[PDB]
Amino acid sequence: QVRLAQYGGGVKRLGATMTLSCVASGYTFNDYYIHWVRQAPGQGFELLGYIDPANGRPDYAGALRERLSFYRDKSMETLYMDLRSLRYDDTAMYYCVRNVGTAGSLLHYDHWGSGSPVIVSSASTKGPSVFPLAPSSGTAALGCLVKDYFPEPVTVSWNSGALTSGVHTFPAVLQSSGLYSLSSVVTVPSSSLGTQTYICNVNHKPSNTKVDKRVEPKSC
Amino acid sequence: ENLWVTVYYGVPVWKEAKTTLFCASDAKAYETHACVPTDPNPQEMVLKNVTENFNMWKNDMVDQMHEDVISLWDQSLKPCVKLTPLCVTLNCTNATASNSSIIEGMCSFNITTELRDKREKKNALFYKLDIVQLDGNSSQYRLINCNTSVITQACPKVSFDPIPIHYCAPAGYAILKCNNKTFTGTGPCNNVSTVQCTHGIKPVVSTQLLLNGSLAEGEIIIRSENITKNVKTIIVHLNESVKIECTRPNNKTRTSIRIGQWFYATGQVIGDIREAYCNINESKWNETLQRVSKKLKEYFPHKNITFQPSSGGDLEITTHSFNCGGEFFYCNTSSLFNRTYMANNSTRTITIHCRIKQIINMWQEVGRAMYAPPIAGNITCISNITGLLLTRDGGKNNTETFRPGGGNMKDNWRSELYKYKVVKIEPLGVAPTRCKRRV
Amino acid sequence: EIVLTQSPATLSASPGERVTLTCRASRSVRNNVAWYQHKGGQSPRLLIYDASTRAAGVPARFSGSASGTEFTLAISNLESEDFTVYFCLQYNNWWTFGQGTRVDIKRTVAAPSVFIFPPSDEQLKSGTASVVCLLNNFYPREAKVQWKVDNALQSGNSQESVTEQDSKDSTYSLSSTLTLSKADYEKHKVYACEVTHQGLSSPVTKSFNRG
Ligand SMILES: *[C@@H]1O[C@H](CO)[C@@H](O[C@@H]2O[C@H](CO)[C@@H](O[C@@H]3O[C@H](CO[C@H]4O[C@H](CO[C@H]5O[C@H](CO)[C@@H](O)[C@H](O)[C@@H]5O)[C@@H](O)[C@H](O)[C@@H]4O)[C@@H](O)[C@H](O[C@H]4O[C@H](CO)[C@@H](O)[C@H](O)[C@@H]4O)[C@@H]3O)[C@H](O)[C@H]2NC(C)=O)[C@H](O)[C@H]1NC(C)=O
Ligand SMILES: *[C@@H]1O[C@H](CO)[C@@H](O[C@@H]2O[C@H](CO)[C@@H](O[C@@H]3O[C@H](CO)[C@@H](O[C@@H]4O[C@H](CO)[C@@H](O)[C@H](O)[C@H]4NC(C)=O)[C@H](O)[C@@H]3O)[C@H](O)[C@H]2NC(C)=O)[C@H](O)[C@H]1NC(C)=O
Ligand SMILES: *[C@@H]1O[C@H](CO)[C@@H](O[C@@H]2O[C@H](CO)[C@@H](O[C@@H]3O[C@H](CO)[C@@H](O)[C@H](O)[C@@H]3O)[C@H](O)[C@H]2NC(C)=O)[C@H](O)[C@H]1NC(C)=O
Ligand SMILES: *[C@@H]1O[C@H](CO)[C@@H](O[C@@H]2O[C@H](CO)[C@@H](O[C@@H]3O[C@H](CO)[C@@H](O)[C@H](O)[C@@H]3O)[C@H](O)[C@H]2NC(C)=O)[C@H](O)[C@H]1NC(C)=O
Ligand SMILES: *[C@@H]1O[C@H](CO)[C@@H](O[C@@H]2O[C@H](CO)[C@@H](O)[C@H](O)[C@H]2NC(C)=O)[C@H](O)[C@H]1NC(C)=O
Ligand SMILES: *[C@@H]1O[C@H](CO)[C@@H](O[C@@H]2O[C@H](CO)[C@@H](O)[C@H](O)[C@H]2NC(C)=O)[C@H](O)[C@H]1NC(C)=O
Ligand SMILES: *[C@@H]1O[C@H](CO)[C@@H](O)[C@H](O)[C@H]1NC(C)=O
Ligand SMILES: *[C@@H]1O[C@H](CO)[C@@H](O)[C@H](O)[C@H]1NC(C)=O
């Protein structure tokens, strides 16, 4: 029955302010505290703070008391949070979550919201650079590096999709500069490096640029 | 041998259960009380060797008190006039008196009166806590709660007020009671008694502190839930009252507006403008906070304790709220709680500025709004603060931080009914004995 | 204060088996502990809201027990859906979460095929020559990589990624990248990646010489 929808997200520029939101639904608004938890990539969950919906009393984590700010709107059953002066390590997807509060104590979470991803990076839309990785020189391997593109998605395939022998495409890693990058590899028999053709196809829809790099020529 | 079933009636044994409780009180005044007819007189019997359990956080009578208070207020406001036609667009510049920044209502509006075809450009005074700017030109304004709820003016003659109330159990139920001098509101009492009715409980409404209350037997008592170190509210009960005084020096001039119903606006403010304020004995407050810190750092033994003012929320929780007469106060308490303590009689007075407003949202929740008619003349008030509604900040390392709160009105009355408990008598019981029944 | 050191990182079990998880609290938390089931990015779900009390709507196969400071969640009939990430919670203090434990498909131990690629010449021309390593088709997840340049350790300035557990053979593929500038890349002649895994009998250290 209860649903905690969320809005706001996408990309927020470095140093700018952002404002997420929540909307309660199928329950008595005053009876349950709301908390805002976040998960940076490659980290465990951590709590920011919580806001009582009835009287609006907030309470923040120690390290983020200056930046955060929570407030609600009882009539619309809406909640908010502002995180001023976004830093690079604020890259995280932020849930709003309910908790089961007793008459005199707070306890576990039960119902989690849909969540709002937030990416902190200040860069325009940009297509990828494509660096071919030298093949290893019974099963050899080779790869290609998709470098410095923004935003996601990106698509990668080999030999115009014709080659699939151990083909893999690792998930992208948000580098310190705010531009994504990933690597794609393919395993082939050792003798194939001298004879078989190798094309790495790269497609980036938001910029629409496309490159089909040849990893074969430097079989060395 | 020759032991047979026997049955006894009127046995002294009971079981705990929830039930409706009676309303009884003294002779009714003012023509919080709407209850008829009764005249209670309680008598207490100390029970030898009676060891009984208690719990302040679970007892049902707190919820019954809450519902009864809400229903009584609803019935009080039921016949009174509704201020719906006042929602029209106000036009406001309001720079007449010496200080308009304090009030800023001096606002005009077109009200329909007594013919339904004629409109009159009345004007009145309002605090701009009650008034919200409309979008566009900043001279257009509107009542704060009109777009969210209807507004009922409180009936001026019906002055509901903290009149004492006695809660009596019905026949077949007994109100138990505990008078252990060091009881924290929970745990077993080995010093138990029973009474027909509770004492003259007053339904006081206040935030950040509860006033006109009782005082503990020993030193200051710190009652809190103990399921988790994470807690919602920590109740502190004083053993020594500190006197708080408040006043509203200006002479207000009531005026009546025909929207046989009538609307009581503020007509004019007489006397030079002085913001409301309150007084506290500085030495008493220092000593009370020192004792509170010393008591409180027993529970939290290896950390510093620091008091700081509340953060965020409505005016009901950011500032100490209460009522004296037919007006409502919201007093900045930052200067009081700004203290810190290390982990290891009336010579001076503190003064705190304070603000008043008329359109009171219903204290428990928003959706129904009250409008307070203005009290003419000047107001003075005196009361006895007796406890603190603190709430601590988690997630802080090697430093506690307790700050005032207590927007939830239920904590005010849960701080009083820690004494009591209701049980159901179970008079019938069996046992073995020697017997015969002739056949 | 309270550091729920959830362990082990990855549990391996065949479908239908019983499996157990642990959540080591750093100190006393009373009975105030809860476990959750994470999903593929979706909203987590409540399984147990005390050390033992099961939550509403949970399948009966989920069970938990207290051990003082240590706490435990046990799945009796491990279905295909249950192969996901679970994290533990405590609400006795300020509220902290565990690192999350993954439950993957068990299989036979498979060693990684190890490769190292020199930085691309086009990347040299851009002035950001960055080395790359590849671990492919291994199991379990425990495999590890250490970057070395002229047998001198490098740390911090590197990244890694891991594929999904490839359902083709239930093995992992992992790649590592060492980010460096051309000037930094010119400081050394030999660049190596020390790859270690229980499937390997030794720290297989692939390397190349510049040029
Ligand atoms: C009856 O009247 C009330 C009173 O006017 C109506 O309540 C208003 O509802 C609207 C819409 O629901 C709200 O507007 C939204 O505000 C969002 C952000 O908040 C605003 O107020 C902030 C004030 O906060 C201050 O305090 C905190 C700490 O407590 C500080 O951190 C903060 O800095 C301030 O000091 C401002 O800071 C903030 O700038 C806003 O002014 C907006 O984000 C939101 O945006 C709209 O537009 C977006 C596109 O730009 C869109 O994506 C959004 O979805 C959204 O459409 C919107 O403007 C008002 O805030 C709220 N009033 C108050 C006083 O809260 C009520 O709706 C009306 N009706 C009923 C039935 O009650
Ligand atoms: C508990 O708190 C309360 C206040 O929160 C303290 O009691 C208050 O004490 C003041 C004086 O110290 C009283 O002020 C006078 O009250 C009388 C009541 O009659 C007023 O007279 C007239 O009252 C009628 C209503 O009955 C009203 O319509 C009239 O306008 C009014 N005036 C005239 C000229 O007729 C009088 O004007 C003062 O206002 C408060 O009434 C009183 N409050 C309550 C609720 O009783 C109390 O001291 C404190 N507890 C302790 C132990 O101190
Ligand atoms: C209760 O009274 C205290 C003062 O005794 C109030 O604190 C003061 O609040 C003002 C609000 O305007 C603060 O000034 C503002 O500071 C911010 C920076 O935080 C600045 O950007 C603004 O331009 C403005 O200068 C002031 O610093 C603050 N002082 C202290 C000592 O806290 C408090 O707000 C009052 N609370 C209520 C509920 O009335
Ligand atoms: C609560 O009590 C503390 C302790 O007295 C108060 O700390 C005071 O904070 C103010 C800034 O808000 C400090 O102001 C000083 O101003 C001068 C002139 O601008 C400047 O040169 C100093 O560097 C300093 O910033 C003040 O020194 C400081 N008091 C002490 C004793 O260090 C706090 O303001 C109080 N808060 C409230 C809400 O009452
Ligand atoms: C009350 O009603 C009168 C009559 O409509 C308003 O009179 C203004 O009359 C001038 C005459 O040219 C118009 O230009 C204005 O637009 C009228 N005002 C409005 C608000 O429509 C008068 O302003 C009204 N006053 C209030 C407080 O509503
Ligand atoms: C009540 O306690 C406060 C806080 O200690 C006292 O305020 C201090 O007074 C001393 C002098 O007695 C000053 O040097 C400090 O600057 C004051 N402020 C603080 C934060 O220490 C106040 O004097 C005490 N009043 C009484 C009557 O005991
Ligand atoms: C109050 O109860 C406590 C509970 O342990 C007990 O130790 C104490 O003696 C009691 N005091 C009185 C006066 O009954
Ligand atoms: C508590 O104990 C004292 C002394 O033993 C006694 O005077 C008092 O009546 C007792 N109260 C209750 C409620 O048992």
XYZ file of N, CA and C in Angstrom, chain A residues 57-139:
249
model
N 11.032 18.493 12.968
C 12.327 18.501 13.633
C 13.326 17.652 12.847
N 14.439 18.205 12.366
C 15.459 17.381 11.722
C 16.552 16.965 12.700
N 17.452 16.124 12.200
C 18.662 15.760 12.921
C 19.620 15.126 11.927
N 20.835 15.667 11.867
C 21.790 15.352 10.814
C 22.957 14.558 11.376
N 23.680 13.896 10.477
C 24.916 13.233 10.862
C 25.958 14.271 11.250
N 26.966 13.832 12.004
C 27.961 14.765 12.505
C 28.777 15.431 11.414
N 29.220 14.660 10.420
C 30.145 15.190 9.425
C 29.475 16.117 8.416
N 28.143 16.111 8.326
C 27.416 16.847 7.296
C 26.379 17.805 7.868
N 26.594 18.340 9.070
C 25.583 19.209 9.662
C 25.485 20.550 8.948
N 26.605 21.088 8.464
C 26.558 22.397 7.819
C 25.873 22.329 6.460
N 26.191 21.317 5.660
C 25.720 21.253 4.282
C 24.247 20.869 4.177
N 23.786 19.913 4.980
C 22.440 19.387 4.822
C 21.390 20.394 5.291
N 20.147 20.149 4.877
C 18.993 20.876 5.393
C 17.737 20.129 4.975
N 16.904 19.762 5.948
C 15.673 19.017 5.706
C 14.462 19.875 6.049
N 13.407 19.726 5.255
C 12.139 20.400 5.507
C 11.057 19.661 4.739
N 9.806 19.882 5.141
C 8.673 19.164 4.573
C 7.561 20.143 4.234
N 6.418 19.580 3.843
C 5.205 20.342 3.556
C 4.036 19.416 3.878
N 3.371 19.676 5.005
C 2.379 18.734 5.521
C 1.187 18.589 4.585
N 0.724 19.694 3.996
C -0.491 19.652 3.188
C -0.356 18.739 1.979
N 0.772 18.793 1.276
C 1.033 17.924 0.138
C 1.649 16.586 0.526
N 2.013 16.392 1.795
C 2.722 15.189 2.226
C 4.003 15.006 1.418
N 4.827 16.050 1.406
C 6.048 16.114 0.619
C 7.210 16.403 1.559
N 8.383 15.866 1.227
C 9.604 16.108 1.979
C 10.711 16.493 1.010
N 11.765 17.104 1.547
C 12.868 17.606 0.742
C 14.171 17.426 1.502
N 15.278 17.621 0.792
C 16.585 17.783 1.406
C 17.487 18.554 0.458
N 18.277 19.466 1.013
C 19.229 20.264 0.252
C 20.641 19.975 0.739
N 21.543 19.716 -0.204
C 22.946 19.440 0.084
C 23.792 20.486 -0.628
N 24.084 21.575 0.069
C 24.804 22.701 -0.503
C 26.263 22.343 -0.757
N 26.819 22.950 -1.803
C 28.238 22.838 -2.131
C 28.637 21.382 -2.354
N 28.066 20.793 -3.401
C 28.355 19.404 -3.728
C 29.833 19.223 -4.039
N 30.430 18.205 -3.430
C 31.794 17.790 -3.712
C 31.773 16.551 -4.598
N 32.954 16.174 -5.092
C 33.032 15.069 -6.041
C 32.568 13.763 -5.408
N 32.947 13.522 -4.153
C 32.585 12.255 -3.514
C 31.129 12.212 -3.036
N 30.279 13.157 -3.432
C 28.844 13.043 -3.220
C 28.160 12.194 -4.282
N 28.915 11.583 -5.197
C 28.320 10.699 -6.189
C 27.707 9.507 -5.478
N 26.383 9.464 -5.422
C 25.687 8.434 -4.672
C 24.217 8.509 -5.030
N 23.516 7.402 -4.811
C 22.087 7.325 -5.071
C 21.360 7.284 -3.733
N 20.409 8.198 -3.558
C 19.891 8.580 -2.250
C 18.474 8.049 -2.100
N 18.255 7.200 -1.098
C 16.921 6.745 -0.740
C 16.283 7.681 0.271
N 14.959 7.768 0.212
C 14.158 8.126 1.369
C 13.524 6.860 1.927
N 13.531 6.738 3.254
C 13.128 5.503 3.917
C 12.306 5.830 5.154
N 11.266 5.034 5.374
C 10.451 5.117 6.575
C 11.069 4.256 7.669
N 10.634 4.486 8.907
C 11.022 3.663 10.043
C 9.816 3.449 10.942
N 9.867 2.376 11.730
C 8.791 2.038 12.653
C 9.112 2.633 14.016
N 8.534 3.794 14.310
C 8.800 4.454 15.577
C 7.789 4.043 16.630
N 8.284 3.589 17.778
C 7.422 3.236 18.893
C 6.979 4.496 19.634
N 6.315 4.291 20.771
C 5.836 5.420 21.557
C 6.970 6.241 22.154
N 8.147 5.645 22.347
C 9.260 6.334 22.976
C 10.626 5.989 22.419
N 10.683 5.371 21.241
C 11.964 5.031 20.639
C 11.775 4.757 19.156
N 12.850 4.953 18.399
C 12.886 4.658 16.975
C 13.580 3.321 16.737
N 13.280 2.715 15.593
C 13.712 1.349 15.306
C 13.977 1.229 13.806
N 14.084 -0.013 13.336
C 14.440 -0.388 11.972
C 13.633 0.298 10.878
N 14.189 0.323 9.667
C 13.458 0.699 8.469
C 12.595 -0.464 7.988
N 11.461 -0.129 7.363
C 10.609 -1.132 6.728
C 10.454 -0.893 5.227
N 10.058 0.317 4.832
C 9.698 0.611 3.445
C 10.682 1.617 2.864
N 11.403 1.203 1.827
C 12.376 2.062 1.170
C 11.776 2.684 -0.084
N 12.159 3.924 -0.361
C 11.708 4.602 -1.556
C 12.429 4.093 -2.790
N 11.967 4.571 -3.945
C 12.526 4.140 -5.219
C 13.950 4.628 -5.446
N 14.385 5.670 -4.743
C 15.750 6.141 -4.860
C 15.962 7.094 -6.016
N 16.932 7.997 -5.871
C 17.244 9.014 -6.867
C 18.747 9.036 -7.115
N 19.263 8.551 -8.247
C 20.708 8.664 -8.475
C 21.127 10.114 -8.649
N 22.323 10.428 -8.156
C 22.916 11.755 -8.271
C 24.355 11.574 -8.723
N 24.725 12.245 -9.811
C 26.082 12.224 -10.346
C 26.618 13.645 -10.286
N 27.691 13.842 -9.528
C 28.328 15.147 -9.401
C 29.472 15.196 -10.404
N 29.306 16.002 -11.448
C 30.334 16.162 -12.463
C 29.963 17.348 -13.338
N 30.950 18.187 -13.632
C 30.767 19.398 -14.429
C 31.523 19.206 -15.741
N 30.832 18.649 -16.732
C 31.395 18.488 -18.059
C 30.258 18.387 -19.063
N 30.481 18.969 -20.236
C 29.486 18.924 -21.293
C 29.421 17.526 -21.898
N 28.394 17.301 -22.712
C 28.293 16.042 -23.437
C 29.490 15.893 -24.368
N 30.082 14.701 -24.369
C 31.339 14.473 -25.068
C 31.415 13.016 -25.498
N 31.829 12.792 -26.743
C 32.008 11.455 -27.250
C 33.290 10.832 -26.735
N 33.461 9.527 -26.942
C 34.631 8.845 -26.383
C 35.850 8.944 -27.282
N 37.015 8.982 -26.644
C 38.249 8.590 -27.302
C 38.380 7.075 -27.222
N 39.059 6.496 -28.208
C 39.127 5.048 -28.373
C 40.592 4.676 -28.548
N 41.173 4.049 -27.523
C 42.571 3.637 -27.526
C 42.642 2.126 -27.692
N 43.223 1.571 -28.763
C 43.340 0.108 -28.839
C 44.480 -0.393 -27.964
N 44.198 -1.430 -27.180
C 45.198 -2.074 -26.338
C 45.877 -3.162 -27.156
N 47.198 -3.239 -27.057
C 47.967 -4.174 -27.867
C 47.580 -5.612 -27.519
N 47.301 -6.481 -28.499
C 47.094 -7.897 -28.173
C 48.320 -8.508 -27.506
N 48.079 -9.539 -26.696
C 49.149 -10.190 -25.952
C 50.131 -10.857 -26.905
N 51.308 -10.262 -27.062
C 52.321 -10.773 -27.979
C 53.629 -10.008 -27.807
N 47.561 -21.144 -25.051
C 46.932 -21.305 -26.349
C 45.993 -20.167 -26.701
N 45.347 -19.601 -25.686
C 44.393 -18.512 -25.854
C 45.068 -17.188 -25.529
